[PDB]
Structure formats: structure tokens, C-alpha cells
Amino acid sequence: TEYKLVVVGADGVGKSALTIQLIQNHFVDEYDPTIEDSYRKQVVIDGETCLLDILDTAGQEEYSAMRDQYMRTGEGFLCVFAINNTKSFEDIHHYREQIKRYKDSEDVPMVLVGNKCDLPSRTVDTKQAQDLARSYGIPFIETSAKTRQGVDDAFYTLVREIRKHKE
Ligand SMILES: Nc1nc2c(ncn2[C@@H]2O[C@H](COP(=O)(O)OP(=O)(O)O)[C@@H](O)[C@H]2O)c(=O)[nH]1
Numbered sequence: 001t002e003y004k005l006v007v008v009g010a011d012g013v014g015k016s017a018l019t020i021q022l023i024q025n026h027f028v029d030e031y032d033p034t035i036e037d038s039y040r041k042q043v044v045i046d047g048e049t050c051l052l053d054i055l056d057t058a059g060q061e062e063y064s065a066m067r068d069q070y071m072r073t074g075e076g077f078l079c080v081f082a083i084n085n086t087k088s089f090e091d092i093h094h095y096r097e098q099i100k101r102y103k104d105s106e107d108v109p110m111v112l113v114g115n116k117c118d119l120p121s122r123t124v125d126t127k128q129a130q131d132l133a134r135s136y137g138i139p140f141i142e143t144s145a146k147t148r149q150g151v152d153d154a155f156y157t158l159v160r161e162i163r164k165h166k167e
């Protein structure tokens, strides 16, 4: 089993910090906001040895075979906003709508991620995000790429969402 995961969201929410934290177990001070790269790691999720294939999107809006491939053939999607960034949360609808267009489905496995929960500058409330994920029928996970809180949980929950879609 090998799960193909796509990390989407507005620029600056921490998509690249979340990915590097999962794969490389550390918080990167700086990561080129224009770099869009694919990352694989073997992990054990719920006693299940599997390989994760993660595309860290940059939102280049350019001709990419790999990115249009991961959007089409990617089986799960992390929808990431920042809890200190109201706009990125208002942006979540555009990203979910775009995913449903690439997959031809209502029920694509997805997770809503609220990153940077270590910050006190909170503009998006837990209930506000919980109440949106409720409408989509997807899970909501609170993360911080800096402290690693919820990083494994977010990525592993998405895999578990993928598992219930095969059944
Ligand atoms: N405090 C805090 N800062 C974060 C977190 N995640 C990302 N950042 C910062 O947010 C900025 C943008 O993050 P980045 O991963 O490049 O976002 P991307 O554009 O979506 O790829 C960087 O300066 C990071 O240091 C977090 O969980 N907590």
C-alpha cells in the first residue's frame, strides 16, 4: 500500500513546513515559497507499514505534468489554512471546489488543517473551523509545524480517510 497525498492551501499557511516536519522531523526556518516538490517516506500508521507520496504545492499556476497528475490521481488532500490568517480560511472553499473538479467526486478523502496553532494571534476559532469541516463531512485537525503538534495526526487521519474510501 502506497498513499498519494497532496498538500493544498493558500501561500504562507505552512504547507511546506508541515511536509518537511513529517518527512524530515524538523522545522525549517526558510523554505522557498515557490518550490513545489514531491516527497516520499515509509511510515507505520496504525501498525500498517506504508509509503506516503506527498506533493507540497506552491500554487505556481503553470504547466506541470506532475502537479496536474497529483491533483488528478492523488487519493487524499490536506486542506491547510493558518489560524492567524482569516483569508486563508476563507480560501478553503476554493481549494475544496478545485479538488472536487479534478477527482469527479463528492466524496474525496480530505482533511481540513488549521496550522500555526502555537501562535496567540488567533483569528479563526476552533468551532468556526470545526463547524466548516462538519459541513464537508471531513475531519479537522489542529496543527503546528513548529512544535510538531498534530503533524502526524493530520497526515495519518488523511490516510485513515483514504482507507474508508476503498471500502
Ligand atoms: N509559528 C509558526 N510558524 C509557522 C508554522 N508553519 C509555518 N510557519 C511559518 O510560516 C511561514 C510560511 O510557511 P511555509 O511552510 O513556507 O508556507 P507555504 O507557503 O504554504 O509553503 C514561514 O516563515 C514559517 O516559518 C507554525 O506551525 N507555527
Ligand SMILES: [Mg+2]
Binding pocket: 015, 016, 017, 031, 032, 033, 034, 035, 056, 057, 058
Ligand atoms: Mg511552500
